[PDB]
Design a protein around this ligand. Structure first.
Ligand code: HEM
Ligand code: HEM
Ligand code: HEM
Ligand code: BA
Ligand code: BA
Ligand code: FE2
Ligand code: FE2
Ligand code: FE2
Ligand code: FE2
Ligand code: FE2
Ligand code: FE2
Ligand code: FE2
Ligand code: FE2
Ligand code: FE2
Ligand code: FE2
Ligand code: FE2
Ligand code: FE2
Ligand code: FE2
Ligand code: FE2
Ligand code: MG
Ligand code: MG
Ligand code: MG
Ligand code: MG
Ligand code: MG
Ligand code: MG
Ligand code: MG
Ligand code: MG
Lengths: 155, 155, 155, 155, 155, 155, 155
């Protein structure tokens, strides 16, 4: 079914943001794994597998709405050379992306593409959870110390 | 443990080839799914998960050899439009990659990084498998007819 | 137990044909499988295994009758190039051996070697079995057409 | 996938050797069985099935590399008259082919067919395995005597 | 089976390094146990068992090649007095053995002893895992501090 | 807890003897195995493991008594060339270590180190069972003949 | 059965020491528990129970030897006020009773009361494991710090 062009452009933009997350979180996940921070590694890993599920959902919707997914563009990954920075970089990434989600939800309501809106609402919820988890880690580092925080991420 | 700089470069080159296959195969997978070719989609989908595992393997090896993974470059993507073309694009891509796998296996051999060579031999063996399956599909199309072939990919 | 010289001669002769069937059917089975025709592959494979059990039986009986098995000579194999032909070559081999069995069974009767006859008797039943399936495949090709037939042999 | 011509020639040579093993070990196994040496017949029988597995693997690789199997030619066949000689002939056959596998591995390596090398790599480790058991049986005969060795092979 | 003379030497060179590893890790393991560092002790132990298995594989190989294993010469152990030093001695030990392994592997290639090579590749692959773990432990000590690292090493 | 200087000395003396048994018995075990004497190989193997467990106990006792385990010094191994000689070598080794054990037990008694004495008593009993087993095998050889004894040690 | 007057005396002496351990360890155990150091409280508790079982054995041996168990006299308990002091108090207590046990074992030996000696040996071993545990905790405190040690003793 021919969907709304602008909706598809919005959907293709969010898709591109998830691609960034996918790659970034997977790299950080292995960087933790490689450092002995197994706990952190697993969480970063699962976050990665979720962005993959998110991208997948958008891909399917874009295809249904008869448009062509953009799996070609890859944005600026924000890596990070150590835990505190990697946490920040990930939070940063999750935030620069919230505005897009909300704008597109707003646009979907205006044109009456409610089904695409529901899809975006769900993705939005997951993003607010990951941000909650990130702010939490960062705060924890402040309360117990980096050495303590890292010690507790080993197993 | 710092590894050979040229080995790490070869590793990163191959990582890039794989990243492309991941994206390409996942899009082709969801496209077949969107068209009703359930069988074809499922297979393409699994090929996608494998390329992802191969990527994860190279990343982990690179990280151990103390180099930086490049999950930032994303080369061209041979998209399909229709089935026969998608099979051809996929095969063509697994083939443009072989020369690279073999160049690196030989290089690793000359520098005595046997563990890296083994990693590459497994990935190699797995690729000659995909090419095998792919060729078979193209030959089947010409033996039974595209219409019959598509009919067989539905359930 | 010393066996009738001519009987062992017949026994060694049929054993020869069986060794040809083995190799020929095994080659067609991998050819079918290489082409993605799994259905033909399995059946050919099994009939190959069957021929192997026939040969084993001939070898044991010959050895008991105190003669030397001839597993050295290998007759000309009839390797087909395409399904329709491969099916016909297998039928020809099966019918060029029927003469032989019947002649050998008749011989055992006239010389009192009833045990050997019972052994050939059962190989004979099994051989007309392969022929029945083979003829049926060729007729099936004529009714539904080669393309549909091959489509049926894929999974 | 068009494979290397010389590689295909090597594969066909290794195949002709195995086809001989298969037949030789099968006749010795049935001979042992016939003589009442169960334990010995059972082992030859498995080696027999093992050579069959190697040939199957060589065949599959050849068809994939788009070459033409060579079942048709059956090389010489060393048949022993008694246990001691049957053990030696079997040992001579393995050791006569070992060089063939080593030359093939070197060739595959030189032309970049690492998959074929690994495939042969495994058949080589298995052929050295058969040899060790053969050497041992001969050595066991010298330490305990022929009559004792045979009595131990009855069950 | 007569093995290459120089290959046997290489195998014994390596067997000699493993014997050293066996003794050093076992002692270190029981020292950690004796201090209440159960986690570290348990891990040192398994690495000690691994080296024992490697030694076993080497011995078996040497015997098959008809050489005489050398369990008489035992080189200089590197005993530590405290955790950090012990970690460093294991690391040093492991790093002094890699060049030997790689040299042996390259020689087996040149003489065509591929089975021995495959054996040495596996051991090599395992030695790198241990080295990775060791390095990681040392980095963990700096990131979180010795007091924390050791506390995490208690049962 | 600080131990007696002389006690620790005796313990190391006995540990030095047990390290010789470990290597000798393990090598003899793999030699029987290579020769096809599974029964015998299996028994040597366990006696080898047994000595490993003994050494482990000595190691622990020593660290607890605050002494330094000596794994560095390795005495001369008595390796055989044929079964009868290999049995006499193990036996001779066991007999040489018998007086050292009783001397240590005696000393431990004279200084009130009953726990160390207890440990030593249990090891002494184990060593005495091994000696019985070795003496028995040598008698069996005399009663039934080397040929028969060796035939019995196969499966 | 009438026992030796002096043996019964030694037994009561050791029973007198064990009754002190019982009370001290039980009190220390409940003090750790009240402070929230479950791990530590649990260990003290079992050592307390252990001493109770020891006293029980001494009681029985004594009645059998026809002597009167002395439960009336209770020596001075060494109660601590903080963990480090509590560990040093238990340790000091164990060290004070070590010479009494060896003295008794010695006497039992000199009069042929081997059964009493046997019992005393087993208790001596248990007391020696406790001493090892206490020495270990004190070393751990030195290596990781009181803060960390105490954090580890919570859950
Ligand atoms: C184009 C972007 C991608 C998409 C749409 C995608 C999608 C998926 C999906 C749908 C799954 C299965 C999830 C499940 O079973 O719940 C998956 C798994 C996985 N992906 Fe990706 N992925 C992408 C990129 C990547 C990349 C770049 C890597 C590696 C660097 C990667 C590594 C993995 C791994 C390791 C798994 C787990 C496989 C397993 O179950 O063993 N993916 N992905
Ligand atoms: C000299 C002629 C041969 C004889 C007498 C023979 C005999 C046998 C027998 C008795 C079995 C076991 C069947 C069962 O119990 O299911 C067997 C299995 C088999 N044979 Fe042969 N065979 C011969 C030649 C070959 C050849 C030329 C090939 C081709 C590579 C081959 C491939 C196989 C395979 C793949 C199996 C299956 C083994 C398994 O079940 O794991 N054979 N053969
Ligand atoms: C240097 C002194 C050694 C000590 C203290 C020692 C100690 C041990 C211990 C405690 C075990 C575990 C036993 C059990 O599970 O009950 C073991 C297993 C073993 N050891 Fe040793 N060992 C020593 C030397 C050796 C040597 C020189 C070899 C020869 C290659 C060897 C080969 C083995 C093998 C093959 C196992 C069995 C591993 C398994 O399959 O679990 N050990 N050793
Ligand atoms: Ba802490
Ligand atoms: Ba149809
Ligand atoms: Fe997302
Ligand atoms: Fe997210
Ligand atoms: Fe791949
Ligand atoms: Fe692939
Ligand atoms: Fe047949
Ligand atoms: Fe047939
Ligand atoms: Fe083979
Ligand atoms: Fe073989
Ligand atoms: Fe090792
Ligand atoms: Fe190692
Ligand atoms: Fe021992
Ligand atoms: Fe012993
Ligand atoms: Fe007690
Ligand atoms: Fe106690
Ligand atoms: Mg549609
Ligand atoms: Mg690292
Ligand atoms: Mg007979
Ligand atoms: Mg093909
Ligand atoms: Mg041998
Ligand atoms: Mg030092
Ligand atoms: Mg201590
Ligand atoms: Mg009474």
């Amino acid at each position: 079914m021919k969907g709304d062009k602008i909706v598809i452009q919005h959907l293709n933009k969010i898709l591109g943001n998830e691609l960034i997350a996918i790659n970034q979180y997977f790299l950080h996940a292995r960087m933790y794994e490689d450092w002995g921070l197994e706990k952190l590694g697993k969480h970063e890993y699962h976050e990665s597998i979720d962005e993959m599920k998110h991208a997948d959902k958008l891909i399917k919707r874009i295809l249904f709405l008869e448009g062509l997914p953009n799996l070609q563009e890859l944005g600026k990954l924000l890596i990070g050379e150590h835990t505190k920075e990697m946490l920040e970089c990930d939070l940063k990434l999750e935030q620069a992306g919230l505005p897009d989600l909300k704008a597109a939800i707003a646009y979907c309501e205006s044109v009456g593409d409610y089904a695409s809106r529901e899809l975006l609402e769900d993705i939005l919820e997951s993003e607010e959870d990951h941000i909650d988890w990130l702010e939490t880690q960062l705060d924890l580092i402040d309360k117990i110390g980096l050495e303590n925080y890292l010690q507790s991420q080993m197993d």
